[PDB]
Design a protein around this nucleic acid. Structure first.
Ligand SMILES: [Mg+2]
Ligand SMILES: [Mg+2]
Ligand SMILES: [Mg+2]
Ligand SMILES: [Mg+2]
Ligand SMILES: [Mg+2]
Ligand SMILES: [Mg+2]
Ligand SMILES: [Mg+2]
Ligand SMILES: [Mg+2]
Ligand SMILES: [Mg+2]
Ligand SMILES: [Mg+2]
Lengths: 98, 206, 127, 96, 151, 79, 114
RNA sequence: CCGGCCGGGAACUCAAAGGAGACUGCCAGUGAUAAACUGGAGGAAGGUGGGGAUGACGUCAAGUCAUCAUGGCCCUUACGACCAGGGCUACACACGUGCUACAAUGGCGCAUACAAAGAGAAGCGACCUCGCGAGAGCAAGCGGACCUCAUAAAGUGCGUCGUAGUCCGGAUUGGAGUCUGCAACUCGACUCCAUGAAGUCGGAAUCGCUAGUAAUCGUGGAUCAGAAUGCCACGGUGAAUAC
């Protein structure tokens, strides 16, 4: 009935706002269809490394983006007060609707 | 010129990241620059505030800004003033609003950037480059540092023909990824040229 | 009960279900033929029934996705010997000797900057 | 990389949305099967620098017009100069 | 092979007759990695050799092949300035690794319309050792044995 | 060959050609607009087409129509 | 089997044969064996003269052969007359369409010499 | 509605976090009873399993003052700034890197099976309709394991071509267009119709690669309004050879 998409670049972290959200639900109202992993999209930026010439040098960086699902089935006005006002985690992105 | 940046290669492990925030392309752009603008303005301001490292994080529609200094009460000013005149224009630059956090730098002789900056600050005062390096090195082995090394570069003292001269004392495994290594960088703008400092400080493992 | 074996090989991954019955073989809802029985290695999907008999004894309905003609037939091949699991581990010894048990870990190797393709190196002349 | 050349690029983004995007949209429909009073196109007499395809794409810090990335808005040189100090969230030397 | 000596990968005894030998043959003749279309031509050329000789399959290959096999071969050897062509009695495993290498090589250099055709006539000429490849056996012996001296 | 839906020509050039037609042709006629599609309403006139160092005189004619002005004013001098 | 051109082709499949004409290239061919309604992989064997002259009329529709050549050359001469770029280049014996000349122009430049 | 499609199902495929696992440790041969190697066992993986990242002190006053920074130097109503048009795309030539071929292990038509990895709101663009076509109009879903780009090609079938400068090869050029963009003359990219050069496997000489590699087949992406045979990534099929 309400699922919250979750994404941040750091993994030893995103599953901590995950298992915080999930926990700050079951304890309260509850339900939550467990936290789903979901395809972590990984951008890859590879660029020349030398100030000038040497096209064979280059650095190969990446940016892993991790997802988590949530899905809470029983919206208890209490669990609503539990998502709200029990949260934070600066580097994580939350999406309440779809 | 063939060593991997020591901080860089660590990140994944043992070394943090001086921007934690998340953004999705569309704003990743403007964001990155906003950062540059805060670390720019704040560095020229807190120049003589022995600032070692400035972290930034935007949490939803906010920018926090943390400031690692070794003279907190200079950054803070009279019971809270300086922090304001900063915060103010820091939140002004980034557009969105901003708090600000002054982290205290424990045992600065261990902070690479703060070491380099001194070696720099001194060369421009006009002091013996050899002496300074050697002083720096000690005060670190003194306070623990299971290793350190500083090197300078070019027109060292005067030399029309440019040198480098390093100085490793202790242990410095720039290959062991576990190794806590604090590597930073400072250039000195002299009357005879531009001398560049690199300091490594080896602190342990795991 | 459904007695199962996974199996997978290079990009493909096949799931092989076993059940004593006939000599009929389903894959992605196909006849052994209608998928690739009539291409390179029809004989190999059956292969995992050589020193271990069938001709019409046991049944096998399977699926598999990813990779290609021979990756999918390698994946399945693994899964069969893997499903021969249930039928004791007596038979899963000359299946070793057969080689069919092993997971063929040979993957496509990356294209690495500076080269043309993994190994292939840009021809050069000195002058 | 040469103030003047930078400046050029700013006025370019400036006009790029004054007229074009806005007033210039009057050309999308003003040129579609709506037939003819040829004044329709003629009106392209506006600042020239007012078109967006006239915007280069320069390293946001140095102005270098080559080796640029839309993700970071920086030249590959500055991208890495920051990458190795964290600076770019989630960005690190990668392998596979 | 400076120090790292090696064994020899082994291939998958042929999808029709069960032989490793023909499985190297197909590979040899194979190109741009088209196994799918490799044995296609090898079986059809073994099919024209099949009844056009009657003799059968297995055995018709064995003979025709039997001819283009070499026994000895020279091997370069840069010593005191000079290159010195040194003869050396060559091993079985390769003794036909070539024979096949040549037999295939001989058929591509040929006028017949198709590869099945080309290949067929080579095996057949070789059956009665009078083809391009059998000559390559002849000229190989003729190369050593002239260096009969060195030994 | 491009343009498709509404052939192009600069305004200043076009109205530099009515400053001749109804008025009668003056001396050669200077435009730097080497893009402009030549029009029937230009035949008989001479348009000075820039190429780099100067403007080359070009008498328009009953078949230079579809082409551009720049097509008749070579830009690279190769002897 | 003459048809349209001085050309007297035939003796293999049709669509292919027709290409012989200077003015038909596979499409104009398919289109004619269809616009005249005839089998397209048939030789001229069985192919009646009665059919051949139905086709002869079909090809008569376009500028093929001699005329094509002349019309095609008139097109090039017109260029040169106008003293335009695409003609200045025809006369100077170099690529018309912008291709580089610093190297590899060859085809439109004749085998290299000095 | 024979569509995982609806109920459900939590098994499996996968998804991404955390785990165990491989140590020459086990038998044995070799070797000084050592290190090691070799063979065998079990095992998904045996001998740093496969690949990547990581490049010591230093050598070339090696490259970069045009990424940026900067000592010194010089211009300053000109060595700076603004605008149009041109030029970096020139063409007797030479060299380097590549792409496309010379063809039946192929070309062609029709049918048809099986990938991986990325991409996206000033975006990816379905569907429908129009156009031989490139494209166009209208318009849905999609910030995306959902939607779109997007029908992988080699392959396998039938059939045709029958060794010919050819139903091989497509340069070159003519003609008519399409899209991007104030603007496709110089010089954009694609398309339809014609056009159909050289080229029948390349002297001396010379390069790559030791395994899912070489060889071949398609796929995406960064840059980018538009402009890839380059570059960076992806999987398909899949060798030969080392005394
Ligand atoms: Mg590959
Ligand atoms: Mg400047
Ligand atoms: Mg641009
Ligand atoms: Mg050439
Ligand atoms: Mg130097
Ligand atoms: Mg130089
Ligand atoms: Mg300066
Ligand atoms: Mg240039
Ligand atoms: Mg053709
Ligand atoms: Mg060839």
């Amino acid at each position: 009935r309400i699922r919250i998409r979750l994404k941040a670049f750091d993994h030893r972290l995103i599953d901590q706002a995950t298992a915080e959200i999930v926990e700050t639900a079951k304890r309260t109202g509850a339900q939550v269809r467990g936290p789903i992993p979901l395809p972590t999209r990984k951008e890859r930026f590879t660029v020349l490394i030398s100030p000038h010439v040497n096209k064979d040098a280059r650095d190969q960086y990446e940016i892993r983006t991790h997802l988590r699902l949530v899905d809470i089935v029983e919206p208890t006005e209490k669990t609503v007060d539990a998502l709200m006002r029990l949260d934070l985690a600066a580097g994580v992105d939350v999406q309440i609707s779809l | 010129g063939q060593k991997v940046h020591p901080n860089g290669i660590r990140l994944g492990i043992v070394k943090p990241w001086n921007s934690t925030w998340f953004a999705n392309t569309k704003e990743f752009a403007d964001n990155l620059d906003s950062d540059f603008k805060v670390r720019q303005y704040l560095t020229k301001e807190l120049a003589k505030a022995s600032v070692s490292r400035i972290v930034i994080e935007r949490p939803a529609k906010s920018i926090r800004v943390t400031i690692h200094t070794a003279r907190p009460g200079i950054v803070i000013g009279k019971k809270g003033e300086d922090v304001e005149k900063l915060r103010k224009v820091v939140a002004d630059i980034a557009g969105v609003p901003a708090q600000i956090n002054i982290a205290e730098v424990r045992k600065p002789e261990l902070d690479a950037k703060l070491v380099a900056d001194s070696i720099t600050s001194q060369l421009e005062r006009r002091v013996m480059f050899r002496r300074a390096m050697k002083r720096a090195v000690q005060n670190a082995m003194r306070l623990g540092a299971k290793g350190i090394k500083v090197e300078v570069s070019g027109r060292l003292g005067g030399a029309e023909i440019a040198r480098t001269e390093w100085y490793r004392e202790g242990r410095v495994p720039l290959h062991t990824l576990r190794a806590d290594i604090d590597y930073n960088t400072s250039e000195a703008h002299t009357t005879y040229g531009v001398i560049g400092v690199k300091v490594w400080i080896f602190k342990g493992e795991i | 009960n459904q007695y199962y074996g996974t199996g997978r090989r290079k990009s493909s991954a096949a799931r092989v279900f076993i059940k004593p019955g006939n000599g009929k073989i389903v894959i992605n809802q196909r006849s052994l033929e209608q998928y690739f029985g009539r291409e390179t290695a029809r004989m190999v999907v059956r292969q995992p029934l050589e020193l271990v008999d069938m001709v019409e004894k046991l049944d096998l309905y399977i699926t598999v996705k990813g990779g290609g003609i021979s990756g999918q037939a390698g994946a399945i091949r693994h899964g069969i010997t893997r499903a021969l699991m249930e039928y004791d581990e007596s038979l899963r010894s000359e299946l070793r000797k057969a080689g069919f048990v092993t997971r063929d870990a040979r993957q496509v190797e990356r294209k690495k900057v500076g080269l043309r393709k993994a190994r292939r190196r840009p021809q050069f002349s000195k002058r | 990389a040469k103030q003047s050349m930078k400046a050029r690029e700013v006025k370019r983004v400036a006009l790029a949305d004054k007229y074009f995007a806005k007033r210039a949209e009057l050309k999308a429909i003003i040129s579609d099967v709506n037939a003819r009073w040829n004044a329709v196109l003629k009106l392209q007499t506006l600042p020239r620098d007012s078109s967006p395809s006239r915007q280069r794409n320069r390293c946001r810090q140095t102005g270098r017009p080559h080796g640029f990335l839309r993700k970071f808005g920086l030249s590959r040189i500055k991208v890495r100069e920051a990458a190795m100090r964290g600076e770019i969230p989630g960005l690190k030397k990668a392998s596979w | 092979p400076r120090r790292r000596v090696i064994g020899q990968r082994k291939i998958l005894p042929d999808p029709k007759f069960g032989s490793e030998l023909l499985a190297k043959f197909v590979n040899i003749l194979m190109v741009d990695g088209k196994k799918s279309t490799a044995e296609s031509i090898v079986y059809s050329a073994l099919e024209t050799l099949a009844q056009r000789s009657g003799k059968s399959e297995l055995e018709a290959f064995e003979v025709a092949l039997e001819n283009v096999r070499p026994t000895v071969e020279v091997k370069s050897r840069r010593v005191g300035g000079s290159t010195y062509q040194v003869p050396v009695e060559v091993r079985p495993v390769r003794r036909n690794a070539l024979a096949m290498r040549w037999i295939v090589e001989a058929a591509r250099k040929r006028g017949d319309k198709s590869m099945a055709l080309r290949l067929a006539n080579e095996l057949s000429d070789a059956a009665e050792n009078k083809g391009t490849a059998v000559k390559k056996r002849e000229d190989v012996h003729r190369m050593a044995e002239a260096n009969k001296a060195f030994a | 060959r491009s343009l498709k839906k509404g052939p192009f020509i600069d305004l200043h050039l076009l109205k530099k050609v009515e400053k001749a037609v109804e008025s009668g042709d003056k001396k050669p006629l200077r435009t730097w607009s080497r893009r402009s599609t030549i029009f029937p309403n230009m035949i008989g006139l001479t348009i000075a087409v820039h190429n780099g160092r100067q403007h080359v005189p070009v008498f328009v004619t009953d078949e230079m129509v579809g082409h551009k002005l720049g097509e008749f004013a070579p830009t690279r001098t190769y002897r | 089997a003459r048809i349209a051109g001085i050309n007297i082709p035939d003796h293999k499949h049709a669509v292919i044969a027709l290409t012989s004409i200077y003015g038909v290239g596979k499409t104009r061919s398919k289109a004619i064996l269809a616009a005249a309604g005839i089998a397209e992989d048939v030789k001229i064997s069985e192919l009646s003269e009665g059919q051949i002259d139905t086709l002869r009329d079909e090809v008569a529709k376009f500028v093929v052969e001699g005329d094509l050549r002349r019309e095609i050359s008139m097109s090039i001469k017109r260029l040169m007359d106008l003293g335009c770029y695409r003609g200045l280049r025809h006369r100077r014996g170099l690529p018309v369409r912008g291709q580089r000349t610093k190297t590899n122009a060859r085809t439109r430049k004749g085998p290299r010499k000095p």
